[PDB]
From a paper:
[name] expresses glycerol phosphate wall teichoic acid (WTA), but some health care–associated methicillin-resistant [name] (HA-MRSE) clones produce a second, ribitol phosphate (RboP) WTA, resembling that of the aggressive pathogen Staphylococcus aureus. We report here that the [name] enzyme of HA-MRSE [[name](Se)] glycosylates RboP-WTA with glucose, instead of N-acetylglucosamine (GlcNAc) by [name](Sa) in S. aureus. Each blade of the homotrimer contains a catalytic domain with a canonical GT-B fold, consisting of an N-terminal acceptor substrate-binding domain (ABD; residues 1 to 68 and 202 to 302) and a C-terminal nucleotide-binding domain (residues 303 to 492). [name](Se) is a retaining WTA glycosyltransferase; therefore, the relative positions of donor and acceptor substrates in [name](Se) and TarP are different.
The ribitol moiety of RboP1 forms three hydrogen bonds with the side chains of Asn9 and Gln265, as well as the backbone carbonyl group of Gly229. Three main-chain amide groups interact with the phosphate group of RboP2. Two of these are from tandem backbone amide groups of Gly229 and Ser230, and the third one is contributed by Asn9; this phosphate group is also hydrogen-bonded to the side chain of Ser230. The ribitol moiety of RboP2 has only contact with the side chain and backbone amide group of Glu10. The phosphate group of RboP3 interacts with tandem backbone amide groups of Met18 and Thr19 and is further hydrogen-bonded to the Thr19 side chain. We could not find any electron density for the ribitol moiety of RboP3, the entire RboP4 unit, and the linker region of the molecule. The interactions between RboP1 and [name](Se)G117R are all conserved as in the binary structure.
Author numbering: 1 to 492
């Protein structure tokens, strides 16, 4: 049967967006006898520890594997030697051979050659990590990295101490990879593979070659590009039999813009749409605006699997409005404090709870101070247990000006809760049924959002009845077996 290779630049912990969605997608795929392997392109010396924590935290599937061009070309370079080459290590043992070791503490140390009458290098020693910074006239020109007893990587610097080149070593202590890095532009340039004895113009070229070397061109092996900046590496491949679909996650338009502009990264993925086997997106509304901005015929509509099956008995009848989302501009919290100003104007017993951490903490604190809704509108901060404090809220307001699918609300609905959400660009219009499960209010209409939010708070039954429909509405639209069937229809 057919095997999948999802694509993104990096994978780590504390990443809860694209990564979570890609990793969730893999789980369902394996259950439908299709492999959901990930492809990354960055160098992590400890990439093995990061992958094990994700599996242990039940965020990654044991069956999901990760392909990386540092791991791949190391395992191939490892084959061409038998013994460990301590050449680099001894070259360093030879640079510091006759130098005084000034141990500043248990971690920091400096080497001084009496004959050279100048400090030669610095040593930072920690648990399983030892770094060497080498100098010439008190100017850093090199950095030697050690991890698990062996040299893993060396970094070369210039006069301005800016990174000019990186070198990657295999498990037999040999140079298998190295690249040029533009000093000021901090951009990856001329990449040189050693075991292939090949030269790549940029990282994009190298990674295309890495995909050609990893994914065997065949009708079965399908490539799903999820990372927007990862697409050039997938568009410029030599595969002729391997299928390639792109997925637009967030809203494609340039955020908080009225000029009809589209984010550069996401603009390029849609202009080369023809070259791909199809450009898939979460909402049907985006399939229209995409056939408007790019007149595409390959655009498909498949939603990101909903991993929420929460069933509970809501009895907490308290006048409280909840908004669990990061404090990013796209959430438009300033509208939420306008809605709160009109809500607390009629009913002074209505409390506003905002949960999350981000770039607008001081913006909201000065906004809450204005109008003096201090005890009413409060910030609860980051919380692991979202469901528990959500179960307590009477209703969930979304003042977000743009969104991908409205995951924040799709979750509040699954927690049988009413939702007064602003009609968003590819947002609530897809699930929020005005009067049936919530209140889709036209954007920038505080007054319309306020009176409706008050109506939910002033009707213990209506709010519970609307919310009861909410969970059933989401379960009905977003069905795994048919979502998987939509995926299968693209693969077949
Ligand atoms: O041209 P290159 O030199 O090869 O590299 C420059 C390139 O333009 C960058 O690598 C891209 O910004 C990164 O590409 P991606 O968009 O595929 O990276 C994914 C992104 O970093 C994303 O934020 C990540 O998956 C984790 O997100 P989350 O924490 O929301 O789940």
């Amino acid at each position: 049967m057919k095997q999948t290779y999802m694509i993104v630049n990096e994978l780590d912990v504390n990443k809860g967006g694209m990564t979570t969605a890609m990793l969730t997608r893999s789980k369902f795929f394996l259950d439908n006898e299709i492999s959901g392997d990930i492809i990354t392109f960055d160098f992590k010396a400890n990439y093995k520890d990061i992958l094990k924590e994700l599996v242990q935290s039940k965020k990654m599937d044991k069956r999901t594997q990760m392909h990386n061009p540092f791991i791949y070309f190391k395992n191939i370079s490892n084959l061409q030697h038998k013994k460990y080459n301590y050449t680099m290590t001894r070259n360093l043992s030879n640079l510091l051979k006759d130098s005084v070791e000034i141990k500043e503490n248990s971690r920091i140390s400096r080497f001084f050659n009496i004959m050279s009458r100048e400090y030669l290098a610095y040593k930072r020693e920690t648990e399983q990590e030892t770094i060497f910074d080498l100098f010439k006239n008190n100017l850093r020109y090199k950095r030697i990295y050690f991890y698990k007893g062996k040299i893993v990587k060396t970094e070369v610097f210039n006069s301005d101490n800016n990174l000019i080149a990186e070198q990657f070593y295999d498990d037999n202590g040999y140079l298998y990879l190295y690249r040029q890095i533009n000093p000021e532009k901090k951009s990856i340039g001329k990449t040189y593979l050693v075991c292939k004895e090949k030269q790549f113009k940029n990282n994009v070229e190298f990674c295309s070659y890495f995909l050609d070397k990893l994914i065997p061109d065949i009708n079965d092996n399908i490539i799903i590009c999820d990372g927007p900046g990862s697409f050039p590496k997938i568009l410029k491949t030599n595969h002729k039999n391997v299928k390639k679909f792109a997925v637009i996650h967030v809203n494609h338009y340039k955020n908080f813009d009225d000029t009809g502009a589209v984010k550069k990264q996401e603009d390029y993925i849609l202009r080369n749409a023809n070259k791909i086997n199809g450009v898939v997106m979460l909402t049907e509304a985006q399939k229209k605006d995409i056939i408007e901005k790019y007149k595409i015929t390959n655009a498909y509509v498949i939603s990101n699997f909903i991993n929420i099956t929460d069933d509970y008995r809501d009895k907490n009848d308290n006048k409280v409005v909840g908004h669990i989302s990061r404090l990013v501009p796209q959430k438009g919290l300033p509208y939420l404090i306008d809605v709160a100003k009109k809500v607390v104007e009629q009913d002074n017993s209505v409390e506003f709870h905002l949960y999350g951490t981000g770039e607008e903490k001081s913006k909201i604190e000065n906004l809450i101070q204005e109008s003096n809704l201090t005890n009413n509108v409060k910030l609860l901060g980051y919380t692991t247990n979202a469901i528990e404090k959500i179960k307590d809220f009477r209703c969930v307001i979304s003042t977000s000006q743009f969104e991908g699918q409205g995951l924040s609300l799709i979750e509040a609905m699954l927690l049988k809760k009413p939702v007064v959400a602003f009609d968003v660009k590819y947002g609530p219009s897809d699930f929020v049924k005005d009067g049936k499960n919530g209140y889709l209010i036209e954007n920038k209409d505080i007054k319309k959002m306020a009176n409706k939010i008050l109506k939910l708070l002033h009707d213990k039954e209506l709010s519970k009845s609307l919310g009861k429909h909410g969970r059933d509405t989401i379960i009905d639209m977003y069905q795994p077996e048919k979502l998987m069937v939509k995926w299968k229809q693209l693969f077949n």
